[PDB]
């Protein structure tokens with residue numbers, strides 16, 4: 001994985017040596033070359049994971065998260081540069097350095113062969129994200145939105161750190177390749193109950209779980225666009241990746257310790273979708289919709305059937321692309337009306353027709369229109385949870401109804417109706433913004449032609 | 460016919476011919492505890508390095 005870790009680090013001299021007019025262009029170009037290079041990770045086999053070294057490997061789970069991660073960096077550079085036009089040059093290079101450092105941490109987070117290196121990189125991705133949010137944020141309470149996001153991801157990962165070293169002394173290793181073959185079944189005890197809680201609560205907070213989702217609509221609202229994109233697309237998916245690695249060691253205690261968490265997730269995917277019906281803030285609506293979609297991923301990982309893992313990894317990749325495009329559309333209107341209120345700017349299809357078509361596509365992917373990979377992931381999770389219990393279809397179909405409702409309500413509220421009369425700073429859509437929307441949506445539509453590369457290790 | 464000794468004579472260390480046997484263990488000690496085995500053998504490199512969680516050297 002060194003052939004991706006080194007050019008990501010070579011983007012640091014590539015961003016601290018360019019001319020004052022060339023620092024966006026060079027980093028965009030060479031991060032696009034790295035994203036093109038990332039497709040060599042699709043050397044995946046039906047039985048054996050692609051094992052590079054003692055430190056890095058990539059099965060069919062980490063590979064699409066890596067391609068999404070290395071693809072997301074040029075998109076964040078294209079998205080973040082318009083509101084840094086009135087920014088100092090050295091602060092601009094520090095912003096690009098935090099994005100490059102976050103990519104560097106993620107591309108060897110997902111390829112952590114050993115689990116405490118996963119913990120170090122997993123907790124090290126916070127600090128560039130925290131600097132981006134609490135330094136290039138917007139409002140007064142960016143310090144509070146960064147405080148709890150440091151607090152919860154350390155108070156939750158403090159039992160995670162203790163639990164992983166406990167396995168290091170018991171099993172003798174935290175190599176996941178070794179721990180596939182030396183895993184002992186975890187019997188019923190209270191000690192193993194708090195062992196399961198210590199292994200799972202950090203990733204529950206990162207997804208987020210319902211009731212633990214209080215950090216996320218605050219943190220997205222206080223973030224800039226690059227922070228919102230990377231939180232919606234990668235940093236939530238760290239928790240799903242970590243659960244899919246960590247439930248190997250947690251059997252069979254998961255089959256009865258998952259019941260409160262599955263009930264929290266199944267009722268929360270209803271409640272957050274109803275909150276999305278009752279939102280005034282557009283970015284908070286996309287935030288709560290992200291919570292609603294990751295609740296199904298929590299359910300699918302906790303029931304641990306093959307259709308559920310296939311649907312959960314398909315839904316993570318699809319929701320990364322969709323929610324990143326939704327936050328970028330919210331930015332494209334916040335760069336014109338300068339407020340996030342959804343009822344403020346209406347009737348935008350009369351003014352921005354092609355941007356309204358990109359809104360239409362993002363909302364149709366958000367409600368899982370077939371044959372998109374949103375629908376493949378949604379449908380497989382619903383199939384597997386029907387196999388878990390036949391009465392879960394009521395909450396599943398009810399969430400799908402409310403999801404269609406708030407996606408088309410968001411579409412109608414921003415893009416339809418009579419426009420606001422007292423707003424006239426609505427410029428035409430730039431070539432940059434349409435390029436950003438197309439680079440989100442066109443891979444999301446190409447993956448429906450060949451969805452087998454995003455269906456995880458047990459396709 | 461006795462002669463009083465000179466200065467420094469009565470503080471000389473003399474030798475004594477004795478017929479009693481020498482005390483082989485006058486402190487009446489028991490046997491000493493066996494010392495720990497020393498180090499021996501050529502110092503080979505450490506097998507796969509530090510072995511500290513993931514550090515391959």
Ligand SMILES: CCCCCCCCCCCCCCCCCC(=O)OC[C@H](COP(=O)([O-])OC[C@H](O)COP(=O)([O-])OC[C@H](COC(=O)CCCCCCCCCCCCCCCCC)OC(=O)CCCCCCCCCCCCCCCCC)OC(=O)CCCCCCCCCCCCCCCCC
Pocket residue numbers: 353354356357358360361364365369370371372442445446448449
């Ligand atoms: C590998 C080779 C692949 C080659 C084939 C390509 C495969 C798909 C790739 C992506 C396709 C979508 C791109 C177009 C839509 C977005 C842009 C847009 O607004 O266009 C309007 C615009 C034309 O309109 P305009 O008058 O100029 O202005 C627009 C108005 O301002 C305002 O616009 P508007 O809103 O009034 O009108 C827009 C209209 C609005 O109408 C809709 O959005 C209705 C669509 C949904 C309902 C109907 C379909 C339901 C499902 C049935 C079909 C699927 C199953 C069929 C299979 C068989 C049966 C199972 O949408 C369309 O006309 C697009 C229809 C086709 C897109 C598919 C449906 C997307 C819906 C969401 C996802 C659904 C699930 C996934 C499906 C994936 C299929 C591959 O299009 C263009 O100018 C074209 C731009 C270039 C597009 C390139 C696309 C490919 C890029 C990939 C590059 C790399 C690969 C190389 C291949 C390149 C091939 C060219």
Ligand SMILES: CCCCCCCCCCCCCCCCCC(=O)OC[C@H](COP(=O)([O-])OC[C@H](O)COP(=O)([O-])OC[C@H](COC(=O)CCCCCCCCCCCCCCCCC)OC(=O)CCCCCCCCCCCCCCCCC)OC(=O)CCCCCCCCCCCCCCCCC
Pocket residue numbers: 001002005006009010012013052053054055056104108120513514515516
């Ligand atoms: C005949 C006579 C002549 C013969 C000549 C033969 C050689 C000719 C070529 C001469 C050049 C040789 C270069 C050194 C040997 C290869 C080193 C290497 O690639 O190791 C891969 C090493 C192990 O990968 P592998 O696939 O398992 O094994 C490949 C080799 O066999 C690795 O071999 P190994 O198994 O023996 O490695 C031992 C062990 C391998 O490592 C381990 O066993 C795991 C421990 C790794 C560190 C984990 C720390 C995590 C927590 C802290 C995170 C800090 C922030 C992250 C970085 C932020 C930005 C700096 O190394 C360490 O633990 C050292 C610490 C990591 C430094 C690696 C070398 C860095 C040199 C350049 C420094 C620039 C900063 C690099 C980032 C350092 C911090 C991560 O990769 C990593 O651990 C990933 C970390 C980053 C890789 C460093 C890439 C080196 C070149 C960078 C040039 C571009 C710099 C751009 C500017 C700086 C950034 C702003």
